[PDB]
Amino acid sequence: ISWNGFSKKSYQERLELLKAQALLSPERQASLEKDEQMSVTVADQLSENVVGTFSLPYSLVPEVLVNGQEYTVPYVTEEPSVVAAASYASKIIKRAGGFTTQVHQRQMIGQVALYQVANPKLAQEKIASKKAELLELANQAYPSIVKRGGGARDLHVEQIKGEPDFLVVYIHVDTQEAMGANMLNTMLEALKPVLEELSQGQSLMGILSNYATDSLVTASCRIAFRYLSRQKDQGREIAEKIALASQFAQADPYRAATHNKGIFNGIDAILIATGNDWRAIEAGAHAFASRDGRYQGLSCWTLDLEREELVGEMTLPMPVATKGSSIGLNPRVALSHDLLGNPSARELAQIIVSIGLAQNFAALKALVSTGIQQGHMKLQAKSLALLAGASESEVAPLVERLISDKTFNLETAQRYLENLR
């Protein structure tokens, strides 16, 4: 069954179409139809100083194709056009065969910072020689994850220079379906005294890192020029401009910020829907954006001229969860996971990066388009009118004729000012 007309349908009609798609159980469908919310009682358990609840829209982005599997994606966003743009981008990319994705690795990194280490290199060697015993100790500290098949997998020690110098111990941990904050903090507390003794130093802190480089996930898409525009060579032109737009975000931090913001319009929307911590994902991705010594766009758009295809690619750290308090307690979060077919965290991560790339595609395409609203046509024609050499009284008649045309440039405004005078 088709999703055609979903945006223009009324609220009630959208629910009927969704029901026809048979994506939700009878319980979840009824929960959605009475727009069941997280209660004050539940809110009061989740947070502190609770005096009520706060609501945002909840929307669907249909036809998200990821590794040959189609998803209907839930969005929570208060920004006009974000859902419409994601849905549009998703249709185009589905027609083009959808996204291809890979999880490079899925582990969490935690760190212990040591200071007042007289001999950092000797401390480094000592700790590294005790690697196996330290990992065992970390694993005994949180046995439930070992039983599930996860646990501490690696440990390394680095000298970080500054004022002062720090000796930093990093642990790499398979947290399975959890984000793993509590797990990592617990393992690090256990290691603290041993690491202090081995380094003859003082522990400053033991904490998870939100720079989740053991959780990188890449999405890509491959879009034939003909899907960008049906017109003869207009598709190639759009593709070129998107690639230039991509190059511009690599060059200018002022563009990069906006480029990456647009990606997170979509990413944060699905993160909220699925009960995931968006501050953690924002921080890791924006740090990742800076890795080459400049703040840069998180995605890349290039041309394959031989195959006549526009190629999009994006790698992000995506340590999302399918187990957590919000997932357990917010009835709409539980619904969002069911809606998606209850993906694993790895699967969810691949969907989310794809969503970001779709969102990026729509923003870039709209940004490089030359067909714009009537209000801005009257405005651009006014600029060309004045640029042609028009006086005060000559502006209004010149605009009327310019807007009557399908397309127009300076030479057209000069031609029309010539005839008028």
Active-site amino acid positions: 79, 261, 277, 376
Site for its own copies in 10-39 (CB under 8 A): 11, 14-15, 18, 32, 35, 37-38
Contact with its own copies (CB under 8 A): which of 20, 30, 122, 205?
205
| Residue 297 interacts with, from Na ion, its own copies, none (CB under 5-8 Å by kind) | Na ion
Q: Residues within the annotated binding site?
A: 144, 148, 177, 179-182, 210, 277
Smallest distance, its own copies to C-beta of residue 65, A: 17
Q: Single out the segment in contact with its own copies by CB under 8 A; choices: 95-103, 105-113, 121-129, 343-351.
A: 105-113
Smallest distance, its own copies to C-beta of residue 92, A: 16
| Residue 395 interacts with, from its own copies, Na ion, none (CB under 5-8 Å by kind) | none
Q: Single out the segment in contact with its own copies by CB under 8 A; choices: 63-71, 119-127, 184-192, 345-353.
A: 184-192
Q: Single out the segment in contact with Na ion by CB under 5 A; choices: 93-101, 127-135, 227-235, 374-382.
A: 93-101
Separation of alpha carbons 274 and 355, rounded Å: 13
Q: What six digits make up the tokens of 42?
A: 């539940």
| Residue 108 interacts with, from Na ion, its own copies, none (CB under 5-8 Å by kind) | Na ion
Residue 237 binds to its own copies (criterion: CB under 8 A):
no
Size of the site for its own copies (CB under 8 A): 126
Residue 253 binds to Na ion (criterion: CB under 5 A):
no
User: For the chain, how many residues are written?
Assistant: 421
- The answer to whether the beta carbons of residues 277 and 80 sit under 8 Å apart is no
Smallest distance, its own copies to C-beta of residue 97, A: 23
Residue 365 binds to Na ion (criterion: CB under 5 A):
no
Contact with its own copies (CB under 8 A): which of 103, 207, 303, 311?
207
| Residue 182 interacts with, from Na ion, its own copies, none (CB under 5-8 Å by kind) | none
Backbone φ and ψ of 297, nearest 5°: -55, 140
Site for its own copies in 388-417 (CB under 8 A): 409-410
Instruction: Please count the other Cβ atoms lying within 10 Å of the Cβ belonging to residue 144.
Output: 9
What does 375-391 look like in DSSP terms, one character per residue? HHHHHHHHHHHHHHT--
Contacts by 281-287 with C-beta closer than 8 Å and gap 24+? 281/316, 281/317, 281/318, 281/319, 281/320, 283/210, 283/211, 284/210, 284/211, 284/212, 284/215, 284/316, 284/317, 284/319, 285/260, 285/316, 285/317, 286/260, 287/210, 287/211
- The answer to whether the beta carbons of residues 367 and 259 sit under 8 Å apart is no
Report helix angle 345-367 to 82-95, nearest 10: 100
Separation of alpha carbons 365 and 51, rounded Å: 43
Q: Single out the segment in contact with Na ion by CB under 5 A; choices: 245-253, 376-384, 394-402, 405-413.
A: 245-253
Q: Which residues of 357-376 are buried (b: 16+ CB within 10 A; e: fewer)?
A: bbbbbbbbbeebeeeeeeee
Cis before 331 (ω within 30):
no
Contact with Na ion (CB under 5 A): which of 262, 315, 398, 416?
262
Backbone φ and ψ of 151, nearest 5°: 125, 175
**Closest Cα to residue 171, out of 112, 231, 103?**
112
Residue 211 binds to its own copies (criterion: CB under 8 A):
yes
Site for Na ion in 286-345 (CB under 5 A): 297, 317-318, 322, 326, 330-332, 335, 337, 342
* 3 state SS of 70: strand
Residue type, 43: A
Q: Closer CB to its own copies, residue 100 or residue 278?
A: 278
Residue 62 binds to its own copies (criterion: CB under 8 A):
yes
* 406 CB-contact burial (10 Å; exposed 0-12 / middle 13-18 / buried 19+): exposed
Q: Residues within the annotated binding site for NADPH?
A: 144, 148, 177, 179-182, 210, 277
| Residue 349 interacts with, from Na ion, its own copies, none (CB under 5-8 Å by kind) | Na ion
Q: Closer CB to Na ion, residue 323 or residue 415?
A: 323
Give the DSSP H or E segment for 109. strand 108-115
Site for its own copies in 119-158 (CB under 8 A): 137, 141
Separation of alpha carbons 1 and 17, rounded Å: 9
Separation of alpha carbons 413 and 421, rounded Å: 12
Per-residue contact track with its own copies, 276 to 295, x per CB under 8 A? -xxxx-xxx-xx-xxx-xxx
Site for Na ion in 38-57 (CB under 5 A): 38, 44, 47-48, 50, 54-55, 57
Regarding beta strands 166-174 and 108-115, do their DSSP bridges make them parallel or antiparallel, or are they unpaired? antiparallel
Smallest distance, its own copies to C-beta of residue 156, A: 12
